[model samples]
Target chain A: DPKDFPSELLSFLSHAVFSNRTLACFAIYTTKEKAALLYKKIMEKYSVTFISRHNSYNHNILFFLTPHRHRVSAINNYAQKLCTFSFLICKGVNKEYLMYSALTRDPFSVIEESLPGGLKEHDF
Target chain B: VEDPKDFPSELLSFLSHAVFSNRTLACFAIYTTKEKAALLYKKIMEKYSVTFISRHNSYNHNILFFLTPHRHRVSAINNYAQKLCTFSFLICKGVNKEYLMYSALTRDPFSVIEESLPGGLKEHDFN
Candidate 1:
């Protein structure tokens, strides 16, 4: 199941970060036709490597993660200006989304603006 | 085993942004041999969401709770019984350590996956 994939990946992400490894994750909403075009065009034509990729339950949204940092720039430059958000977690997780690498930041202003609305710190 | 010291400090701080928002969202967790906790999770799922449901595993005694498409009801989600009652579930009213929403783009996982045909999302374009 598609949900199974993300649950596993989420566990992997949490496990990897806690283990002191490096990784980055990104999310986007897309349709099949464009996704296919995107697949045929940039993914194959441009040769970008996605460490892991999974579709949302409806096959409309996509989420991908990578350990490599350079290619994050490409998504920012060439993507169709769709809903996109990317971030990196290295030695110390950068809590500041604004502190995230420019190339790896959320491509949409609405997303960046809405991120901090309901968040508050509390000891678990 | 995860040690508290092993947790990333910045990720620790950033987790605050993971709260469940006004957006359509669902929260779930696995419980082991804990029926009271599982029962309360089911209760809170109903109390919190205008629509909700749960699942039970016989052998392992694990229970999963799901709440979604909130009705804009529920008095207060803060420090509710679900926080410590049985394991932990997301508190929609605010952020807590046990609750973190990575993405709330859809109301439920099925809405995204089930609407599509069999294996429709199997292949993706990742660049």
Candidate 2:
């Protein structure tokens, strides 16, 4: 009964994206324990259309879609609140491209080296 | 209507009809404290032409759904909402919307399993 859920969900997500109803896609990184905890916390309240974990350097990367913005400030706030190492990436033009990069590349390698105002780091 | 399930069921019914109807529209939900959501609802009503608004069930958080007039982009609303809340997602039309409904009813994300990758993406790549 549950076997078809993934496809059904993907179809639903694709329809939304194609319809231009989806607003943003995001990826977050943290330790596996914190990632699991954060996942539980987020899923408790938000409607995360797609969410999954990927492993990298003893850390877990989480990718998901939301009909809302996951702004940099908010991600920073969460990092501080959880007292864990974390970072986030917001999908630009190609969502699939970003997903591919996140799945295939290292977290540090995937991030842009030189931001608009030079590379900056926020300590949490 | 007194049953705990009645409210969410009513919400699901309304969304089901809205998603399929030939109307240019956007629907999304937000998770926040009840007080903040109420304030947000009041603020949003002043500007956007919303068709529906309601608070869905969540034991530890307030989940609110808003259906509004169609737009090519929601950045205006998205920016406005980010100023008020930390987390929210769209209630886009599809089987996944129902999946979200079920999750709301059960208060568990795992209650509805969703695919995280698009087709042709191998799972082992991330491992």
Q: Write down the TM-score of every candidate.
A: 0.22, 0.29
Native contacts present in each candidate (fraction): 0.00, 0.00
Report the TM-score of chain B alone for all candidates. Answer: 0.34, 0.46
Interface RMSD of 2: 9.9
* Candidate 2, residue A104: lDDT: 43
Worst ten-residue run, lDDT, model 1 chain B? B110-119
lDDT of 2 by residue, B20-93 (tens): 44334355554455444554565555456665455544544455555555541344554566554344432233
**In model 2, what is the error at residue B19, expressed in angstroms?**
57
Where does candidate 2 stray beyond 4 Å?
A1-23, A85-124, B1-127
Give the alpha carbon lDDT tens digit for every residue of A4-120 in model 1.
222312322232223433334433334333343334333443343331122333443333333454333344344443212122212222232222222132332121221233122
Clashing pairs in 2: A67-B90
Off by over 4 Å in 1: A1-124, B1-24, B30-33, B58-61, B71-78, B83-127
Worst 10-residue lDDT window, candidate 1 chain A: A83-92
> lDDT tens digits, residues A29-115, model 2?
555555555565554434654455556555555555444655434543554354222343222223443453445455422221111
Worst 10 residues of 2 chain B by lDDT: B109-118
Q: Looking at model 1, give its docking quality level.
A: incorrect
